Amino acid sequence: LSHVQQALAELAKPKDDPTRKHVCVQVAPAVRVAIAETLGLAPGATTPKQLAEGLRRLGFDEVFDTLFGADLTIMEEGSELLHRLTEHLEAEPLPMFTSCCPGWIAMLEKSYPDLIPYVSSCKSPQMMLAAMVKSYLAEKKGIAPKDMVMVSIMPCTRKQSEADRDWFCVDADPTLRQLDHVITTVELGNIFKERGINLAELPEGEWDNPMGVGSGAGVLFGTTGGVMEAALRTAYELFTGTPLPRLSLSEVRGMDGIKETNITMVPAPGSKFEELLKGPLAWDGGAGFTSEDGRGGITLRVAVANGLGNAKKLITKMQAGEAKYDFVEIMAHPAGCVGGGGQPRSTDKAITQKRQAALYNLDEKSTLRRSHENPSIRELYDTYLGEPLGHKAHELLHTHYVAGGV
Ligand code: SF4
Numbered sequence: 085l086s087h088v089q090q091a092l093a094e095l096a097k098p099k100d101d102p103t104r105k106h107v108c109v110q111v112a113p114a115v116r117v118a119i120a121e122t123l124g125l126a127p128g129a130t131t132p133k134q135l136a137e138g139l140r141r142l143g144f145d146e147v148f149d150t151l152f153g154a155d156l157t158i159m160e161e162g163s164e165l166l167h168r169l170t171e172h173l174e175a176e177p178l179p180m181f182t183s184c185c186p187g188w189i190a191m192l193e194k195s196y197p198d199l200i201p202y203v204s205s206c207k208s209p210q211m212m213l214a215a216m217v218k219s220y221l222a223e224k225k226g227i228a229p230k231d232m233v234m235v236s237i238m239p240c241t242r243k244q245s246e247a248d249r250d251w252f253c254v255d256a257d258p259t260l261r262q263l264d265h266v267i268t269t270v271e272l273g274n275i276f277k278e279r280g281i282n283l284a285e286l287p288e289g290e291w292d293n294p295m296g297v298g299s300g301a302g303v304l305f306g307t308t309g310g311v312m313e314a315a316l317r318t319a320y321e322l323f324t325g326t327p328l329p330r331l332s333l334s335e336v337r338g339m340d341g342i343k344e345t346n347i348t349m350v351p352a353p354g355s356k357f358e359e360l361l362k363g364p365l366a367w368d369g370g371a372g373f374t375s376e377d378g379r380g381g382i383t384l385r386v387a388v389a390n391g392l393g394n395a396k397k398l399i400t401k402m403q404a405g406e407a408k409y410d411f412v413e414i415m416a417h418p419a420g421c422v423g424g425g426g427q428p429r430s431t432d433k434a435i436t437q438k439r440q441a442a443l444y445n446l447d448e449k450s451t452l453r454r455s456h457e458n459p460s461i462r463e464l465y466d467t468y469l470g471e472p473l474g475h476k477a478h479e480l481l482h483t484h485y486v487a488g489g490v
């Protein structure tokens with residue numbers, strides 16, 4: 085009936101029931117930090133592996149970290165960004181908009197269909213992971229996609245509408261969903277409480293690797309700063325041969341909910357990028373500089389807009405040419421996903437700051453991890469997907485947009 089009820093019905097089946105399916109769950113980071121609040125505790129007061137244990141006790145056959153999907157998104161979108169940059173250094177338009185927030189995608193399609201060509205063709209992390217589970221993992225385990233159920237726990241309900249886009253299906257059969265059911269943080273919390281499960285008192289469980297082999301979640305130790313920042317890093321580090329530090333965006337004067345930064349990029353010596361330098365949105369042709377000796381570069385102008393109302397104001401200035409950016413992330417909630425509409429309600433005005441702070445442990449925050457270094461990701465491309473942006477990657481991990489909405 086409801087997606088929660090459908091999910092629980094599948095989990096209710098005995099595992100030796102002939103009609104039992106292989107029921108998988110994936111979990112967003114914003115969920116892991118906020119779920120403790122459903123018990124009246126502080127953000128982060130329950131550990132990620134306590135949650136994994138709780139989910140396994142509900143009956144899930146696989147418990148995945150959505151960050152695995154996010155590593156795919158970083159690979160694809162980093163490649164996409166670099167490709168667009170390359171094309172515009174040679175004379176797929178710039179600026180490029182990210183695509184992970186379904187609140188943005190809905191407003192894009194309904195109110196800004198002329199901007200569609202500028203948006204990343206990448207699916208979200210949850211949809212990339214889901215597509216891979218019902219293709220690669222299904223084949224590896226010898227399970228018919230028909231007998232796989234994919235559930236995600238998300239900080240917002242509208243990840244369901246993302247999941248429901250018709251062509252997010254297996255082998256062109258729209259009844260065979262890549263991602264079946266989305267459950268929110270609060271909904272999951274209520275499931276635990278109704279069953280007398282206290283997450284804070286559980287032993288640590290374990291994650292499953294979407295590759296179907298190896299221990300753990302298939303995600304390396306450390307943090308990325310998110311999909312937008314890591315897509316940037318991927319492109320930057322290839323272009324320059326130098327590391328991109330963790331970003332610190334600064335607030336824009338006289339524009340609510342907008343943060344920005346400028347990234348100067350000098351092409352790596354002897355690279356093709358060094359040789360290269362040597363529509364509705366008025367793109368100024370990029371911000372370029374050059375030195376006397378011939379060591380010039382380009383400056384990449386980046387923006388993050390949180391809140392759709394705030395995003396509309398940014399778009400107006402961009403259309404007017406009063407604001408120039410090359411890469412832009414639009415998220416529908418003011419604090420981003422930690423502030424999603426499926427999150428617990430608090431009287432604390434600073435709850436989203438507490439959630440953001442508890443999102444990752446300090447040890448992991450001191451380690452920068454990079455998607456292309458993940459052996460599980462490497463394996464998937466080497467043995468199944470081929471190349472980022474290739475045909476197979478396009479089929480499974482990329483999407484399109486529909487003027488007027490779906
Ligand atoms: S910003 Fe809000 S609507 Fe968008 S993906 Fe995050 S929680 Fe969902």
Ligand SMILES: O=S([O-])[O-]
Binds near residue numbers: 425426
């Ligand atoms: O989609 S809602 O939960 O913000």
Ligand SMILES: [Cl-]
Binds near residue numbers: 150184208209210211
């Ligand atoms: Cl996602």
Ligand code: NA
Binds near residue numbers: 144145146
């Ligand atoms: Na299992």
Ligand code: NA
Binds near residue numbers: 290291293298299300
């Ligand atoms: Na495991």
